[PDB]
DNA sequence: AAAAAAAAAAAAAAAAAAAAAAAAAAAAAAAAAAAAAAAAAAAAAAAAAAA
DNA sequence: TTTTTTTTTTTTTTTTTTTTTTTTTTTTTTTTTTTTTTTTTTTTTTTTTTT
């Protein structure tokens, strides 16, 4: 039906607003993102619900609550990583595209603040690694949907690319950061040539030391940058 | 004796028209939510008048 | 100069109306069947005409 859908989603919104730290939050987010493309009215309501639940300007005070929301989003994505990313990406298309006009640009500021604050969290991380790779993966998705949001920090992302370990999650770091570089390098405003030099050098160094899929997904980036 | 060609009514046959019916879809109505607009009211500000 | 009084603007609340959405019900044009009538065509005998 179309009634029942609206009613159950209303109940879910009240649940996720009122008494957080309930266990089943993540799954609720997974199901609601699963239903983003089904209809029209449902689409409008989920769009406005997600615009008020996460992507709000979040003024620069009480940063701990903001970090807790960040924890929420990272948990959601890291749990839905198994099935697929298509619904999330479609949702992101909807939220970004749906405001092409000036219209005070409410979301652009907030999203850029989410990515830079995640960068900063990554910075102070310094050394749970599942959460690290999940955050980098979230960075990857946010780059894929729109590349302008992650233009400034790629040179700061370079040191992770240089050396890493022989564990799976680390390999996921290597492939995802290569993917990000592939996505962002052509749009980077006036890069430095030595930066490209060391990029290409360690890319070859990575090729000569690791498995199949990582070699594939990095020589891809090599072809793109060349 | 012979013979050919043309008409007229009656008979068939296929296409179109006229009842008869069945089913999808447009319409209407009710409820109820969500929104929008208008009226009013409360507070803030800026000017004007007197001591 | 300062104190006291007036007026305009801004913003929030509320109430009535409007819009929306679904759902259920209804009644209508649409679609198919059957018939069946008409009209055209056909035939065959009759009539007309020719040798």
Curated annotation (Swiss-Prot):
HEAT repeats: 85-124
Disulfide bonding pattern of the chain: none
Location relative to the cell: Nucleus; Chromosome
Tissue: Widely expressed. Highly expressed in heart, skeletal muscle, fetal and adult liver, fetal and adult kidney. Expressed at intermediates level in thymus, placenta, peripheral leukocyte and small intestine. Weakly or not expressed in brain, colon, spleen and lung.
Domain of life: Eukaryota
Stretches of the chain forming a coiled coil according to its record: none
Entry text on domains: Contains one Pro-Xaa-Val-Xaa-Leu (PxVxL) motif, which is required for interaction with chromoshadow domains. This motif requires additional residues -7, -6, +4 and +5 of the central Val which contact the chromoshadow domain. The C-terminal region containing HEAT repeats and Pro-Xaa-Val-Xaa-Leu (PxVxL) motif are involved in the recruitment of NIPBL to sites of DNA damage.
Family membership: Belongs to the SCC2/Nipped-B family.
Disease / disorder: Cornelia de Lange syndrome 1: A form of Cornelia de Lange syndrome, a clinically heterogeneous developmental disorder associated with malformations affecting multiple systems. Characterized by facial dysmorphisms, abnormal hands and feet, growth delay, cognitive retardation, hirsutism, gastroesophageal dysfunction and cardiac, ophthalmologic and genitourinary anomalies.
General function of this protein: Plays an important role in the loading of the cohesin complex on to DNA. Forms a heterodimeric complex (also known as cohesin loading complex) with MAU2/SCC4 which mediates the loading of the cohesin complex onto chromatin. Plays a role in cohesin loading at sites of DNA damage. Its recruitment to double-strand breaks (DSBs) sites occurs in a CBX3-, RNF8- and RNF168-dependent manner whereas its recruitment to UV irradiation-induced DNA damage sites occurs in a ATM-, ATR-, RNF8- and RNF168-dependent manner.
Subunit record text: Heterodimerizes with MAU2/SCC4 to form the cohesin loading complex. The NIPBL-MAU2 heterodimer interacts with the cohesin complex composed of SMC1A/B and SMC3 heterodimer, RAD21 and STAG1/SA1. NIPBL directly contacts all members of the complex, RAD21, SMC1A/B, SMC3 and STAG1. Interacts directly (via PxVxL motif) with CBX5. Interacts with ZNF609 (via N-terminus). Interacts with the multiprotein complex Integrator. Interacts (via PxVxL motif) with CBX3. Interacts with BRD4.
Name of the protein in question: Nipped-B-like protein
Organism of derivation: Homo sapiens (Human)
UniProt lineage: Eukaryota, Metazoa, Chordata, Craniata, Vertebrata
């Amino acid at each position: 039906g179309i009634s029942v859908r609206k009613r159950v989603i209303k109940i879910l919104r009240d649940i996720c607003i009122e008494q957080p730290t309930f266990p089943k939050i993540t799954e609720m987010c997974v199901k609601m993102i699963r239903r983003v493309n089904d209809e029209e009215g449902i689409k409008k309501l989920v769009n406005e619900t997600f615009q008020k639940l996460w992507f709000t300007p979040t003024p620069h005070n009480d940063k701990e609550a903001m970090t807790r929301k960040i924890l929420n989003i990272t948990d959601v994505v890291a749990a839905c990583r198994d099935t697929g990313y298509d619904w999330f990406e479609q949702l992101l298309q909807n939220l970004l595209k749906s405001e092409e006009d000036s219209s005070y640009k409410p979301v652009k500021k907030a999203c850029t603040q989410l990515v830079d604050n995640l960068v900063e969290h990554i910075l102070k991380y310094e050394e749970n690694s599942g959460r690290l790779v999940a955050c980098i993966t979230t960075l990857f998705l946010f780059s894929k949907i729109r590349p302008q949001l992650m233009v400034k920090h790629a040179m700061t992302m370079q040191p992770y690319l240089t050396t890493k370990c022989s564990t799976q999650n680390d390999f996921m770091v290597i492939c995802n950061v290569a993917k990000i570089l592939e996505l962002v390098v052509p749009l980077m405003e006036h890069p430095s040539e030595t930066f490209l030099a060391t990029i290409e050098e360690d890319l070859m160094k990575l090729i000569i030391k690791y498995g199949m899929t990582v070699v594939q997904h990095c020589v891809s980036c090599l072809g793109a940058v060349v």
